Each structure stands twice: as C-alpha cells, then as structure tokens.
Symmetry: C3
C-alpha cells in the first residue's frame, strides 16, 4: 500500500514471480556462403574468393576452440600517248581505292571487335560490383546477428534476429510453447536464459552450427514479489529505523519473506529455479497490511549512514533529519506529518542538494546520428568528339565537281564528225 511510507518503509520494487527451466533445445544452422545465381557465372568469382577467405580468417579461431573441446599524224599519236598515260593515272587511283577500301574494312571488324569486346567487359564489372556489395552486406549482417556466438565459444545471450529466425518469424507461437506473454519478452531476453553456443563448424562448406537453449517459464498469478527498504525516522527510542525484510511475496492473505538467491531478477520479472519463503514476525505482517502501529524500530545504524536513497531516478529522503534544498525551484522541501519521509522527483524538483552531495533529478539529451555521402565526379577521358565532316564534306562536294567536269568532257565528243 502507501501508508507504510509513514514509518520510513518505502516500496522500491514490484515484479511478478516466475518458475523457469532450461528444457528447450534448438539448432540454428547458418549458411555463411549465400545462394549464388543459377547462371553460375565465374564473373563473381573475384568478390567471393576474398569473402570466403575472410571467413576462414574469422571463423578458424572459433572452430579451433571447439575442435579441441604527216604533220597531223604526230597529233593522232600524241593523243594516244595522252590517253594511254591518262589511263595510267586512273589505274593507280584504282589501286589506291582498292587498298583504302581494305584499310576501312579492316577497321570495321576492329572497332566492332573492340566495342563488342567491351560489351562483355562492362557487363562483368556490373555483375562483380553488385556481388561485391551484396556479399559485404551479408558479412556485416552475420557479425551482428550471430556476433555473440562467433566472438565466444561458451554460452552467449542470443540476438533478437537470431531468435526471430529460430521461430521462423512466427513469434507468438514460440512464446506460447515456452509460456511467455507478449509483454514479457523484453525481460525474458535480458535474463541470459536465451543463450547459444557453436557446436560444429565446417571450414570447407563454411557452415556454422549453433546450439540454442530456451527456458520454459510458468507464470504465478496473485503472487508478486515486493522489494522493501527503510530509512531513519525518529521514534519512541529516538532516531531509529523500521525493521522489515528486503524481499517479500504475497498470496491472498499470506505474506512471507522471499529468498531471491534461487532467482534471476529483472526490471519487472523474476525468473526463479525454486521458491523458498520464510515466516516473519506477527508484528511485521500486521504492519505491511496497514497497521503502522505494529512495526518495531531499532538503532541498528552508524553515524556515516545516509538519511536518503535513490529510487527510479528519484531521491527518497527524510527532510526533517536533513535540510532538503531544492536548487532549480528555490525553496526548502518538506512533507505533511502523515508521511515521515519525503519523496523528491522530477515533478517537484530538477536539482537537489542534500547533506554532502548534490544530485540532479532532471536532464534531457537529444542527438542525431547520420552520415553525409558525397560522390566524386571522375571526369572520363573517353569522349565521342571525332569531327571528320570538314574532310568528308570536301569529298561529297569534290565528287560533284568531278562528275560535271567529266560531263563537259563526254559532251565535247557529241560534236565529232567522221
């Protein structure tokens, strides 16, 4: 209840009681080498060759710690020597063309077998690239999901992902088989009852095997363990402390001291191997129900003992035995006689100064973790800036003048008599 805080007794903890047993075994088999494409191309043989190599460099130590555990007549002749020499000049132009047509034809299948020789080059780079990145993502994924197991041979608390994969996704089913509620997983994992340890590792196949161990818990209703602490308050004796156990468990109208030696405690759940309770004095039970007039006090204390304590980011102090100075909101703190002890939290004070120390009962820290990616523009020297049109045009035009200069020639024959 609450009136028990009128005798220096304050409830610090309140959690449910559970009984567990490590009677659930599993076996997660991890395939270090991902499933390569059906194409089976040896173009990704480069990124993988290095990936598989960094696996042996990373797993061997782990596997090691397991394996060991007339006058005109001269003109008619001159004309002959003129056209017999003209044909001599045409036969050469023909050789220059019949050999240049080869220099162009030879250059055809060249640039063709060089662009087609690049079509298979760039094709490989894109594949190698994708694989190189996709393969790195996996190695940085395993060292996160199964890090704890890779980094140590002995039992290590599993990873959510590792467990998520174990249940095959269907989590609500896994929990039910163990007897765990939805609002109890956070504490279940944070208890070290979900451990795992490597068992068999193959260097060749790169296939890691892990042995999982899960607990079977049985919740106990109507039974809740309560943690109790006490401060110093003046009484009939004078400056004494209330006498109450540290941990108690209640069922209906039965209250007894709980031995937390057989149990693993959390923030809101206690998983116990066994339950051992002890009978408490009748004067104690009477008090814990509300009868504050039943609690016994004693001077079991020294001079260096503190008149306060910490509870859930708060400070519970006796402000009549110590001046509670509230800094941020100026003024001295106190409480009605109904409560022998004052509770100071964030709702009434941000900075407090007690006898000796100065605790800060408030604070806020908001930060952002991001990354600014900047890519460099590597100017590629490769450019398509070949301008041979100035020469090409002078040909498409020079040919025109060669055709008409011939037309005049061929038309000068239309005027020949005989």
């Amino acid at each position: 209840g609450r009136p028990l805080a009128a005798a220096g007794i304050v409830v610090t903890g309140d959690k449910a009681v559970n009984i567990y047993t490590s009677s659930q075994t599993g076996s997660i088999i991890v395939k270090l080498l991902p499933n390569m494409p059906k194409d089976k191309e040896a173009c990704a043989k480069a990124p993988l060759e290095a990936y598989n190599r960094t696996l042996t460099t990373l797993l061997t130590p782990l596997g090691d710690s397991i394996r060991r555990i007339n006058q005109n007549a001269a003109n008619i002749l001159r004309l002959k020597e003129s056209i017999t020499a003209t044909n001599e000049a045409v036969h050469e132009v023909t050789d220059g063309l019949s050999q240049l047509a080869v220099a162009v034809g030879k250059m055809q299948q060249f640039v063709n077998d060089q662009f087609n020789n690049t079509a298979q080059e760039l094709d490989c780079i894109k594949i190698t690239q994708q694989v190189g990145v996709e393969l790195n993502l996996y190695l940085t994924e395993l060292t996160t999901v199964f890090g704890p197991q890779i980094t140590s041979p002995a039992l290590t608390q599993l990873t959510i992902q590792a467990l998520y994969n174990l249940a095959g996704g269907n989590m609500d089913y896994l929990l039910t088989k163990l007897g765990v509620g939805n609002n109890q997983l956070s504490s279940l994992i944070g208890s070290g009852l979900i451990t795992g340890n490597p068992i068999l590792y193959d260097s060749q196949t790169q296939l890691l095997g892990i042995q999982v161990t899960l607990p079977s818990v049985g919740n106990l209703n109507n039974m809740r363990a309560t943690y109790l602490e006490t401060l110093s308050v003046s009484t009939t004796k004078g400056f004494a402390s209330a006498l109450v156990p540290k941990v108690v468990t209640q069922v209906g109208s039965v209250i007894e001291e709980l031995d937390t030696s057989y149990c693993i405690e959390t923030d809101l759940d206690l998983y116990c191997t066994r339950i051992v309770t002890f009978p408490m004095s009748p004067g104690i039970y009477s008090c814990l129900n509300g009868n504050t007039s039943a609690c016994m006090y004693s001077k079991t204390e020294g001079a260096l003992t503190t008149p306060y304590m910490t509870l859930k980011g708060s400070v519970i102090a006796n402000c009549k035995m110590t001046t509670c100075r509230c800094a941020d909101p100026p003024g001295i703190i106190s409480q009605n006689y109904g409560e022998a002890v004052s509770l100071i939290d964030r709702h009434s004070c941000n900075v407090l100064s007690l006898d000796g120390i100065t605790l800060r009962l408030s604070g806020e820290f908001d930060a952002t973790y991001q990354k600014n990616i900047s890519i460099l523009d590597s100017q590629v020297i490769v450019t398509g800036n070949l301008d041979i049109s100035t020469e090409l045009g002078n040909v498409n035009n020079s040919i025109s003048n060669a055709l008409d200069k011939l037309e005049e020639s061929n038309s000068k024959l239309d005027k020949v008599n005989v």
Copy 2:
C-alpha cells in the same frame, strides 16, 4: 553419492576447484590500415580515402575517452578538249581521295586513342573494385574481433580471434603457460578473466593499441566443489527439510563447507582468488558419506515455499506432497520409497503440471539462416553492330567494273594506225 537423495538432498552442481591470479599481461597492436600493394598505384586512393575517413569517425570517440583518462581539224581539237576535261575530272577524284585518306587516317589514331584510352579506364575500375570490397571485409572484421574493445574503454572480455592472434596461432602453448587444460578453455573465456582495454590510439597512422590481461590458474585435483539443495520431506517431526550447506569441497576423507565469495563460478569450473572452508557438524559429514540416518531435519519453511525445483532442464519434486501430472505421457508420477524425492526429466515426461504451474520438459527448434543473392542484368547499350559491308562490297565490286571498262578503252588503242 546417490543415496543422499533419499532425504530430500539433491546434488545440483559438480565442478573442479581452481586458483587464479591476474599476473599475465599482453599488448595487441592492431594495424587499421592494411598493407597496400607494392605497386603503390593511386587507383585505390578512392576506396581508401573513404575507409580511412570512417575509421576516424569510429575511433575518435574511443581515443577521446583515453586521451582524457579542215573539217576533221575540229575533231582533233574536240578530242583534246575531251581528254583535257577528262583529266580535269580525274584530278578532282584524286583530291577527294587524298582528303578521304586523311579522314580515315585521322579516325585511325582516334578510335585507337579511345580504346587505348579505355584500356586504362577499365583497368582502374577492376583495381578500385577489388580494393573496395577487400577493404570493407577488413572493417567488418575488426568490429567483430576487437568490437568489445572499440565499443568500450574499460575492461571487456576478449574475442576468440583476438586471443587466437595473441598466441600467434599456437594455442596449446599459450594455455600451458597459464596452466589451462584443453577441456577448460570454454569456461576460461566465459569467466571474464580474459579481458582487454585500449591504451594508445594514433589518429594519423590509424594504429590501435590494446592491453591484454590473462590469468594464471592452478588446478586442484582430488578436490571438487559440490552444490547442494534440499526439498521438503515428511519426517519424525512432520513436513520438514534436511539441513545441509549449499557448497562443499571434499579432499580424500575431509569434507568442509566452501565459501564461494572469493571465487568465480562457471558451468564446470570455479576459479577462486582464495579458499575459505568451514567445519560442519559431525551429523552432517556422516550423512554426506551415505549415513542418511544422521541428517537432522527442521521446519524452517513457510506456506508459500515450493515442493519442487529446477535442475539442468529438469524438475525435482516431492510427488507425495504434490500430485505430479504428466501431460504428454498421461499418468501420475511417483517413485519407490527408496527415493523420498522424484526426478522428472525428458526421459520420462515431456510436459508436466505441478501445483500452480505447468512446466514443459521438452522442445526442439531447428532453423536455417541463409541469403538468396540475385544479380540484375543491366543491358549494356554498347554493341558492335556496324554493318558497312553492303557499301564496302559495292566498292570491291564497282572497282572490278571500272578496271574492265578501262581494259576495253586501253584495248581500243591497239587498233590505231599511223
């Protein structure tokens, strides 16, 4: 032994005793920047520039927390003007060829200095690629081997790989120097005695220094600590519990209670700073040897105390004070009078329901962790599909007709008289 389980006393733990001391220091110096090729090419300057940058973004915080701690006469003339104009048409075809031969020659050293300009491009990409992947593998390798040390300044349990590297591979030698057996490494690492902490980090060289601390253990034979717990069994008094210590150590015929406050316990090994034993009542020693008739009982118990407990995934319960209902294999469970307490495990029951809770004494979970890699086929627009043969052929053929049309011309002169 086993007959002690006839008085409600059950052996839960059984481990060897060890004496240890943190008198072994080491120093692992990690080279964050790998050994670059002797070629010293500045083609891998891109992947490294970013890698070295993410190291300072990842290590600075760590280093920070350390730095601060006639009528025919007209024909003879007409023929002249016919061939003087024909040569006029040949001189132009020559200019068109002598300028096209340049347009082709200029295009030669172009595509040549563009394919050769690509031969050094693709060459760089392949290098950059390999480095980019190889360098990522290392960063995802260090955050796994030396993660614990990078993530925290204070002492942190080393990684198998970190230790494996420390011993230089030869592990059997390292253990011998510390006095550790082969079948004792699993517990040795899982004790937190193999810790390490960063000491000196250089931002420039990217060279991390870690201080290792190893224990020197001395095994004690003939001495084994045994953990003992007790349940409630009806006796001369009626509904009482046997009185026996929690931890005891035996040597030959000497049995005494062991103080486990100076020791770190494991699954099968206890590493102790010291050994403190206490003498136990003669009535106790007599019992632990086999004389069950010597053990004393007492009603040190409450009403909320459990009539059972958990042991190695099993449930040891008194099935005469509580109805043990076996679910999976229907039927009530009990045991011969020879054993006051019943042991229920997987070999006799898969699901049990006791007074209050229902524990599951069996379960199997097999899962597989893999990754399906699928690469995309980026169709490269670059193709070698230049078909200039239709035009090329029309030349290799048109030249033939130009050669024979000239042969007729040159043969029409063989029939000239003078």
Copy 3:
C-alpha cells in the same frame, strides 16, 4: 596503513564512494539511410536498393519485439571509243568513292555514338562503385556503434561512440552535468549505468529511435571504502585468523563497516544507491588505526582452507605456515617478523609454487593484427592496336604516282598542232 599487515590483515581494495540516480533521459535518433547527393542521380539506385533491403532484414526482428511490447578516219573513231570507255571507267571509280565516303561517314557517327555511349557507362560505374563502398562502411559502422541496441530490446550498455554522439562531441560538458570527473569515465561506462533501449522504429523511413538513460553521481570526498581480507597467522591461541569486516568506510576519525549491497563496485569507483554503515567493536577500530595489539583472533577455519590468496596479479601468503618456493629465481621466500605475511609479486618472483598449486606471477604476450591486401591484374582484352598505316601509306604514295602519270598525259597535249 601498512602495519596492519603484521596481523594477517591485508588491504585488497581502495575506491572512492559515490551516490548515483538514474534521473537523466536522452533520445538518440539514428538515420539508417544516409544523405544522398543533391544530384539525385538514379545511378546509385542499385547499391542502395540492396542496402535498404538488408536493413529491413536486420531491423524487423528488433522492431517486432517492440511493436508487441579514210584509213585514219578509223583512228579518229577508235580514239573516241577509247576515251568514251575511259570516262566509263572513271564514272565507276566515282561511284565507288561516293559510296565508300558514306561507309566512312556512317562509321564516324557509329564509333562516336559508341565511345560517347561508353562515356556515360564508365561514368555510372564509378558513381555506383563509390556509393557501394561508402554505403557498406555505414552499415558496418552502425552495427558497431549501436550494435548492443540492435541486438537486444532490453537495456544494454551504450557505446562510447553512441555517447560521444549524444554529447555532440563536447564531452567535458556532458560529464559536468552528471557530476563526473575526467578520470572517472572509464569506471562510469563500465558500470551499466549508461544504458539504452530502442523505442520506435520506422520500416519505411528506416529511422531508429533509442531511449538513453544516464546517472547523476555525487562524489563524496574524505570518504573512501576499503576492502579487507585476512589470512591465518599463529597467535596466543595458535594458528588463528584476525577478525575484521570485509568493507569499511572512513570519514576523518570515524570508521564503520560499509554495506555494499546497495552499491555497484568498479576498479576504483563505487556508485551507490544508498549508504548503510554499521558500528564495529572498539577493539576493531583501535586496530585499523595502527594498534595491532587490539585485534582479536579466532580459529574460525577448516583444514582445507588456503594459507594464501590472490591480489592484483600477486600472491599474499604466510610463508611460515607454507614453504614458498620461488621457481624462476631459485630460493625459499620469507619476510621479517615485522610482517606476519609475505607479499610475493613480479618484482621478486616470476614463478611460484605453494602447497598444492604452482602459480605464474609473470608473463608477456605481444602480437600484431594486420592484413596483407593483394590485388589481381585482370588483363583487359581491349587494346588500341590498329595498324592500318601500311595500307594508308600505300595510298598516300600511290596517289603521287597517279598525279605525275597524269602530268605526263596532260603534258603530251602541249605538243599538239592544228
């Protein structure tokens, strides 16, 4: 002091006293997807597509555990049929040129639109490459900085980097707000008071949210807790042990026993929720000040109790009740009567053998962790080795002979009469 070691009492621990409270909350919001370049190019859509995919495959499990919690006349005619056929041979050479000039022009815009088609290909690969590597560095960076939080839903000890980012770099300011000194951070983080747990995760935006919890500590000067242990030394009784508490706290001239149940201990700092001290016998206080003649002894011990213990990599043993054999430096060890107990460390012995075990008080292990990167030289088939100069030259030269063979023709006409 030191004279207390003349009664078998040795100081093992010496740390400062602190009062803490979890009254400091923070919220680190992590942007899983980095800030892409302003260019917004879809050329990095490949590496990111896979990166974002491995995030959902890595975070969903985490988010899941939160969402649910004449005769010559014949000659004048023969000459006509000679040049009319010669022009017939020139008109064809013209067609072969006017069609080859097209085969070259068509090949111009081809290799041009294939090199320019590659200029945008290589450009993309370089971008994709840089992004692929830069993006991998981030995923291997987060699984290290926020690994503990990604791997578990419940509270987990933060990472230096995570905290460094929280304080926005300015660390000296953060500590001051909590009341932590510079030479106290190592112990502060290694206490589990700097915890954090995921609270909200968005699958779409890939934005992780973590709730941070920091303590507010108030140092206590003039007060230092001291850990005390005792060995067996012969006295008036004979073979007994000194009687002194395990932990004590002193303030000025006030010495009392300290209850370390409310406190978290470290290597040099104790962070306590509260301080509970107990009064000790006057005979005890007198001794701890120096009056060794005031300490009481008792035979509270068994036969299996050890005559030694471990302290900071050393062994404190009674070398008059046990023969201390120093191995490395041969000889038996002992100490002046002034000190009832001998302290054996590295400064006086490297290997020791006591009654039962043989501890090694010295050792050094230096190792180096590095990586040798070797890149492969993938010979690119793409080469610029087109040598069409042998054919090109035969044209540039054949044209010369065609020009002069025509010059003779055109000069044979200069000798024509009419």
